[PDB]
PDB file of all heavy atoms in Angstrom:
ATOM      1  N   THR A1767      25.306  14.783  30.196  1.00  0.00           N
ATOM      2  CA  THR A1767      24.149  14.106  29.605  1.00  0.00           C
ATOM      3  C   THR A1767      22.892  14.305  30.448  1.00  0.00           C
ATOM      4  O   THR A1767      22.902  14.129  31.681  1.00  0.00           O
ATOM      5  CB  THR A1767      24.424  12.604  29.465  1.00  0.00           C
ATOM      6  OG1 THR A1767      25.530  12.420  28.588  1.00  0.00           O
ATOM      7  CG2 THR A1767      23.232  11.851  28.874  1.00  0.00           C
ATOM      8  N   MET A1768      21.791  14.626  29.766  1.00  0.00           N
ATOM      9  CA  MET A1768      20.442  14.567  30.330  1.00  0.00           C
ATOM     10  C   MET A1768      19.761  13.411  29.617  1.00  0.00           C
ATOM     11  O   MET A1768      19.623  13.439  28.377  1.00  0.00           O
ATOM     12  CB  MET A1768      19.668  15.852  30.091  1.00  0.00           C
ATOM     13  CG  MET A1768      18.251  15.804  30.639  1.00  0.00           C
ATOM     14  SD  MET A1768      17.284  17.266  30.249  1.00  0.00           S
ATOM     15  CE  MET A1768      17.032  17.052  28.477  1.00  0.00           C
ATOM     16  N   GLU A1769      19.407  12.376  30.376  1.00  0.00           N
ATOM     17  CA  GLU A1769      18.690  11.240  29.829  1.00  0.00           C
ATOM     18  C   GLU A1769      17.227  11.333  30.168  1.00  0.00           C
ATOM     19  O   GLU A1769      16.829  11.365  31.337  1.00  0.00           O
ATOM     20  CB  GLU A1769      19.243   9.914  30.352  1.00  0.00           C
ATOM     21  CG  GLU A1769      18.547   8.737  29.723  1.00  0.00           C
ATOM     22  CD  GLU A1769      19.219   7.414  29.998  1.00  0.00           C
ATOM     23  OE1 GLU A1769      20.325   7.402  30.597  1.00  0.00           O
ATOM     24  OE2 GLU A1769      18.619   6.389  29.585  1.00  0.00           O
ATOM     25  N   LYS A1796      13.239   5.064  37.536  1.00  0.00           N
ATOM     26  CA  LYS A1796      14.638   5.133  37.927  1.00  0.00           C
ATOM     27  C   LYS A1796      15.020   6.588  38.165  1.00  0.00           C
ATOM     28  O   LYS A1796      14.885   7.433  37.286  1.00  0.00           O
ATOM     29  CB  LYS A1796      15.508   4.472  36.854  1.00  0.00           C
ATOM     30  CG  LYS A1796      15.057   3.072  36.431  1.00  0.00           C
ATOM     31  CD  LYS A1796      14.868   2.044  37.560  1.00  0.00           C
ATOM     32  CE  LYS A1796      16.103   1.918  38.459  1.00  0.00           C
ATOM     33  NZ  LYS A1796      16.124   0.734  39.373  1.00  0.00           N
ATOM     34  N   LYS A1797      15.401   6.900  39.390  1.00  0.00           N
ATOM     35  CA  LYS A1797      15.919   8.220  39.712  1.00  0.00           C
ATOM     36  C   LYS A1797      17.425   8.204  39.897  1.00  0.00           C
ATOM     37  O   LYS A1797      18.033   7.156  40.155  1.00  0.00           O
ATOM     38  CB  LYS A1797      15.258   8.759  40.973  1.00  0.00           C
ATOM     39  CG  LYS A1797      13.768   9.046  40.831  1.00  0.00           C
ATOM     40  CD  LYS A1797      13.196   9.583  42.128  1.00  0.00           C
ATOM     41  CE  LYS A1797      13.682  11.001  42.420  1.00  0.00           C
ATOM     42  NZ  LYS A1797      13.379  11.382  43.823  1.00  0.00           N
ATOM     43  N   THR A1798      18.013   9.386  39.720  1.00  0.00           N
ATOM     44  CA  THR A1798      19.424   9.662  39.984  1.00  0.00           C
ATOM     45  C   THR A1798      19.464  10.822  40.979  1.00  0.00           C
ATOM     46  O   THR A1798      18.427  11.261  41.475  1.00  0.00           O
ATOM     47  CB  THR A1798      20.158  10.016  38.686  1.00  0.00           C
ATOM     48  OG1 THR A1798      19.496  11.081  38.003  1.00  0.00           O
ATOM     49  CG2 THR A1798      20.203   8.811  37.739  1.00  0.00           C
ATOM     50  N   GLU A1799      20.651  11.291  41.331  1.00  0.00           N
ATOM     51  CA  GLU A1799      20.753  12.352  42.335  1.00  0.00           C
ATOM     52  C   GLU A1799      20.089  13.654  41.889  1.00  0.00           C
ATOM     53  O   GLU A1799      19.401  14.310  42.681  1.00  0.00           O
ATOM     54  CB  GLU A1799      22.211  12.646  42.670  1.00  0.00           C
ATOM     55  CG  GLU A1799      22.361  13.584  43.866  1.00  0.00           C
ATOM     56  CD  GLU A1799      23.784  13.703  44.379  1.00  0.00           C
ATOM     57  OE1 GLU A1799      24.707  13.101  43.790  1.00  0.00           O
ATOM     58  OE2 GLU A1799      23.975  14.433  45.390  1.00  0.00           O
ATOM     59  N   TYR A1800      20.311  14.015  40.637  1.00  0.00           N
ATOM     60  CA  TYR A1800      19.801  15.247  40.049  1.00  0.00           C
ATOM     61  C   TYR A1800      18.911  14.929  38.861  1.00  0.00           C
ATOM     62  O   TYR A1800      19.300  14.147  37.971  1.00  0.00           O
ATOM     63  CB  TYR A1800      20.968  16.126  39.601  1.00  0.00           C
ATOM     64  CG  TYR A1800      21.883  16.504  40.750  1.00  0.00           C
ATOM     65  CD1 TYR A1800      23.109  15.872  40.932  1.00  0.00           C
ATOM     66  CD2 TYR A1800      21.482  17.450  41.686  1.00  0.00           C
ATOM     67  CE1 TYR A1800      23.932  16.207  42.006  1.00  0.00           C
ATOM     68  CE2 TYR A1800      22.299  17.795  42.752  1.00  0.00           C
ATOM     69  CZ  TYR A1800      23.505  17.160  42.906  1.00  0.00           C
ATOM     70  OH  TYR A1800      24.288  17.528  43.980  1.00  0.00           O
ATOM     71  N   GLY A1801      17.755  15.575  38.815  1.00  0.00           N
ATOM     72  CA  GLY A1801      16.798  15.335  37.747  1.00  0.00           C
ATOM     73  C   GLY A1801      15.639  16.304  37.791  1.00  0.00           C
ATOM     74  O   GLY A1801      15.485  17.099  38.740  1.00  0.00           O
ATOM     75  N   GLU A1802      14.822  16.241  36.741  1.00  0.00           N
ATOM     76  CA  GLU A1802      13.564  16.986  36.657  1.00  0.00           C
ATOM     77  C   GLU A1802      12.487  16.062  36.112  1.00  0.00           C
ATOM     78  O   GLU A1802      12.788  14.957  35.644  1.00  0.00           O
ATOM     79  CB  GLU A1802      13.736  18.228  35.779  1.00  0.00           C
ATOM     80  CG  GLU A1802      14.613  19.273  36.467  1.00  0.00           C
ATOM     81  CD  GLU A1802      15.011  20.448  35.611  1.00  0.00           C
ATOM     82  OE1 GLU A1802      14.740  20.465  34.392  1.00  0.00           O
ATOM     83  OE2 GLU A1802      15.668  21.354  36.186  1.00  0.00           O
ATOM     84  N   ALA A1803      11.243  16.492  36.197  1.00  0.00           N
ATOM     85  CA  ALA A1803      10.142  15.637  35.807  1.00  0.00           C
ATOM     86  C   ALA A1803       8.907  16.410  35.400  1.00  0.00           C
ATOM     87  O   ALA A1803       8.648  17.511  35.879  1.00  0.00           O
ATOM     88  CB  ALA A1803       9.791  14.688  36.928  1.00  0.00           C
ATOM     89  N   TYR A1855      11.191  17.010  41.655  1.00  0.00           N
ATOM     90  CA  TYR A1855      11.878  15.709  41.576  1.00  0.00           C
ATOM     91  C   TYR A1855      11.956  14.980  42.921  1.00  0.00           C
ATOM     92  O   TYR A1855      11.840  13.760  42.976  1.00  0.00           O
ATOM     93  CB  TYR A1855      13.273  15.911  40.995  1.00  0.00           C
ATOM     94  CG  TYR A1855      13.974  14.673  40.459  1.00  0.00           C
ATOM     95  CD1 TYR A1855      13.526  14.026  39.299  1.00  0.00           C
ATOM     96  CD2 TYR A1855      15.104  14.176  41.089  1.00  0.00           C
ATOM     97  CE1 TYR A1855      14.195  12.936  38.792  1.00  0.00           C
ATOM     98  CE2 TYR A1855      15.776  13.085  40.592  1.00  0.00           C
ATOM     99  CZ  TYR A1855      15.313  12.468  39.453  1.00  0.00           C
ATOM    100  OH  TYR A1855      15.999  11.387  38.976  1.00  0.00           O
ATOM    101  N   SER A1856      12.095  15.743  44.016  1.00  0.00           N
ATOM    102  CA  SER A1856      12.175  15.160  45.359  1.00  0.00           C
ATOM    103  C   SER A1856      10.918  14.453  45.829  1.00  0.00           C
ATOM    104  O   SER A1856      11.004  13.615  46.717  1.00  0.00           O
ATOM    105  CB  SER A1856      12.592  16.222  46.386  1.00  0.00           C
ATOM    106  OG  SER A1856      11.586  17.214  46.559  1.00  0.00           O
ATOM    107  N   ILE A1882      10.799  11.662  32.920  1.00  0.00           N
ATOM    108  CA  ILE A1882      11.877  11.881  33.895  1.00  0.00           C
ATOM    109  C   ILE A1882      13.111  12.308  33.108  1.00  0.00           C
ATOM    110  O   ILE A1882      13.432  11.691  32.092  1.00  0.00           O
ATOM    111  CB  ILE A1882      12.149  10.561  34.665  1.00  0.00           C
ATOM    112  CG1 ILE A1882      10.903  10.149  35.461  1.00  0.00           C
ATOM    113  CG2 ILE A1882      13.360  10.662  35.584  1.00  0.00           C
ATOM    114  CD1 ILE A1882      10.493  11.094  36.561  1.00  0.00           C
ATOM    115  N   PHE A1883      13.803  13.351  33.583  1.00  0.00           N
ATOM    116  CA  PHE A1883      15.011  13.861  32.950  1.00  0.00           C
ATOM    117  C   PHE A1883      16.132  13.761  33.971  1.00  0.00           C
ATOM    118  O   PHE A1883      16.160  14.541  34.914  1.00  0.00           O
ATOM    119  CB  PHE A1883      14.813  15.313  32.533  1.00  0.00           C
ATOM    120  CG  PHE A1883      13.672  15.507  31.567  1.00  0.00           C
ATOM    121  CD1 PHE A1883      12.405  15.789  32.019  1.00  0.00           C
ATOM    122  CD2 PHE A1883      13.885  15.396  30.194  1.00  0.00           C
ATOM    123  CE1 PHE A1883      11.352  15.963  31.110  1.00  0.00           C
ATOM    124  CE2 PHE A1883      12.844  15.564  29.293  1.00  0.00           C
ATOM    125  CZ  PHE A1883      11.584  15.838  29.752  1.00  0.00           C
ATOM    126  N   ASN A1884      16.996  12.756  33.818  1.00  0.00           N
ATOM    127  CA  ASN A1884      18.083  12.505  34.768  1.00  0.00           C
ATOM    128  C   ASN A1884      19.399  13.096  34.284  1.00  0.00           C
ATOM    129  O   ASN A1884      19.773  12.921  33.129  1.00  0.00           O
ATOM    130  CB  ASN A1884      18.222  10.999  34.992  1.00  0.00           C
ATOM    131  CG  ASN A1884      17.094  10.438  35.835  1.00  0.00           C
ATOM    132  OD1 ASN A1884      16.314  11.191  36.414  1.00  0.00           O
ATOM    133  ND2 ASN A1884      17.024   9.122  35.932  1.00  0.00           N
ATOM    134  N   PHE A1885      20.112  13.760  35.188  1.00  0.00           N
ATOM    135  CA  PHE A1885      21.329  14.469  34.847  1.00  0.00           C
ATOM    136  C   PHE A1885      22.581  13.669  35.226  1.00  0.00           C
ATOM    137  O   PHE A1885      22.561  12.856  36.176  1.00  0.00           O
ATOM    138  CB  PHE A1885      21.347  15.836  35.540  1.00  0.00           C
ATOM    139  CG  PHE A1885      20.105  16.667  35.320  1.00  0.00           C
ATOM    140  CD1 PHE A1885      19.731  17.610  36.256  1.00  0.00           C
ATOM    141  CD2 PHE A1885      19.330  16.526  34.175  1.00  0.00           C
ATOM    142  CE1 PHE A1885      18.606  18.393  36.067  1.00  0.00           C
ATOM    143  CE2 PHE A1885      18.213  17.312  33.980  1.00  0.00           C
ATOM    144  CZ  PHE A1885      17.847  18.248  34.923  1.00  0.00           C
ATOM    145  N   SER A1886      23.657  13.869  34.466  1.00  0.00           N
ATOM    146  CA  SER A1886      24.959  13.233  34.779  1.00  0.00           C
ATOM    147  C   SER A1886      25.660  13.874  35.971  1.00  0.00           C
ATOM    148  O   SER A1886      26.482  13.207  36.624  1.00  0.00           O
ATOM    149  CB  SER A1886      25.876  13.250  33.559  1.00  0.00           C
ATOM    150  OG  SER A1886      25.953  14.556  32.991  1.00  0.00           O
ATOM    151  N   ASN A1887      25.375  15.148  36.223  1.00  0.00           N
ATOM    152  CA  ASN A1887      25.903  15.877  37.371  1.00  0.00           C
ATOM    153  C   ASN A1887      24.894  16.963  37.757  1.00  0.00           C
ATOM    154  O   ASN A1887      23.801  17.042  37.172  1.00  0.00           O
ATOM    155  CB  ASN A1887      27.269  16.489  37.017  1.00  0.00           C
ATOM    156  CG  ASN A1887      28.395  15.473  37.042  1.00  0.00           C
ATOM    157  OD1 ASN A1887      28.718  14.906  38.089  1.00  0.00           O
ATOM    158  ND2 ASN A1887      28.994  15.229  35.883  1.00  0.00           N
ATOM    159  N   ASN A1888      25.238  17.784  38.747  1.00  0.00           N
ATOM    160  CA  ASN A1888      24.414  18.914  39.161  1.00  0.00           C
ATOM    161  C   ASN A1888      24.483  20.049  38.136  1.00  0.00           C
ATOM    162  O   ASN A1888      25.087  21.103  38.403  1.00  0.00           O
ATOM    163  CB  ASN A1888      24.913  19.399  40.533  1.00  0.00           C
ATOM    164  CG  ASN A1888      23.999  20.422  41.182  1.00  0.00           C
ATOM    165  OD1 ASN A1888      22.955  20.806  40.645  1.00  0.00           O
ATOM    166  ND2 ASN A1888      24.404  20.880  42.365  1.00  0.00           N
ATOM    167  N   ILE A1889      23.850  19.863  36.974  1.00  0.00           N
ATOM    168  CA  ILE A1889      23.954  20.861  35.896  1.00  0.00           C
ATOM    169  C   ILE A1889      23.158  22.147  36.150  1.00  0.00           C
ATOM    170  O   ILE A1889      23.427  23.169  35.514  1.00  0.00           O
ATOM    171  CB  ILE A1889      23.577  20.301  34.506  1.00  0.00           C
ATOM    172  CG1 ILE A1889      22.083  19.990  34.394  1.00  0.00           C
ATOM    173  CG2 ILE A1889      24.410  19.075  34.163  1.00  0.00           C
ATOM    174  CD1 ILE A1889      21.551  20.314  33.013  1.00  0.00           C
ATOM    175  N   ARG A1890      22.174  22.091  37.052  1.00  0.00           N
ATOM    176  CA  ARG A1890      21.438  23.291  37.481  1.00  0.00           C
ATOM    177  C   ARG A1890      22.141  24.075  38.591  1.00  0.00           C
ATOM    178  O   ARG A1890      21.739  25.204  38.875  1.00  0.00           O
ATOM    179  CB  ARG A1890      20.037  22.926  37.983  1.00  0.00           C
ATOM    180  CG  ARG A1890      19.177  22.158  36.997  1.00  0.00           C
ATOM    181  CD  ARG A1890      19.113  22.834  35.638  1.00  0.00           C
ATOM    182  NE  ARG A1890      18.056  22.230  34.834  1.00  0.00           N
ATOM    183  CZ  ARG A1890      18.073  22.087  33.513  1.00  0.00           C
ATOM    184  NH1 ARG A1890      19.093  22.515  32.769  1.00  0.00           N
ATOM    185  NH2 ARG A1890      17.038  21.497  32.923  1.00  0.00           N
ATOM    186  N   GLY A1891      23.148  23.484  39.237  1.00  0.00           N
ATOM    187  CA  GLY A1891      23.847  24.145  40.350  1.00  0.00           C
ATOM    188  C   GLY A1891      22.999  24.365  41.598  1.00  0.00           C
ATOM    189  O   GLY A1891      23.189  25.357  42.309  1.00  0.00           O
ATOM    190  N   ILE A1892      22.069  23.449  41.875  1.00  0.00           N
ATOM    191  CA  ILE A1892      21.189  23.564  43.057  1.00  0.00           C
ATOM    192  C   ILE A1892      21.916  23.219  44.362  1.00  0.00           C
ATOM    193  O   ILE A1892      22.949  22.542  44.350  1.00  0.00           O
ATOM    194  CB  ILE A1892      19.902  22.711  42.933  1.00  0.00           C
ATOM    195  CG1 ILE A1892      20.208  21.212  42.755  1.00  0.00           C
ATOM    196  CG2 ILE A1892      19.053  23.215  41.775  1.00  0.00           C
ATOM    197  CD1 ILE A1892      19.053  20.313  43.136  1.00  0.00           C
TER     198      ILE A1892
END
Side-chain angles (χ1 to χ4, degrees):
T1767 298
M1768 179 185 71
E1769 183 169 354
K1796 310 306 307 194
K1797 294 180 71 193
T1798 54
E1799 189 170 3
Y1800 300 103
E1802 290 171 353
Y1855 197 69
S1856 67
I1882 297 296
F1883 301 92
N1884 287 350
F1885 308 154
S1886 50
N1887 282 296
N1888 190 0
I1889 69 143
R1890 304 309 193 213
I1892 59 159

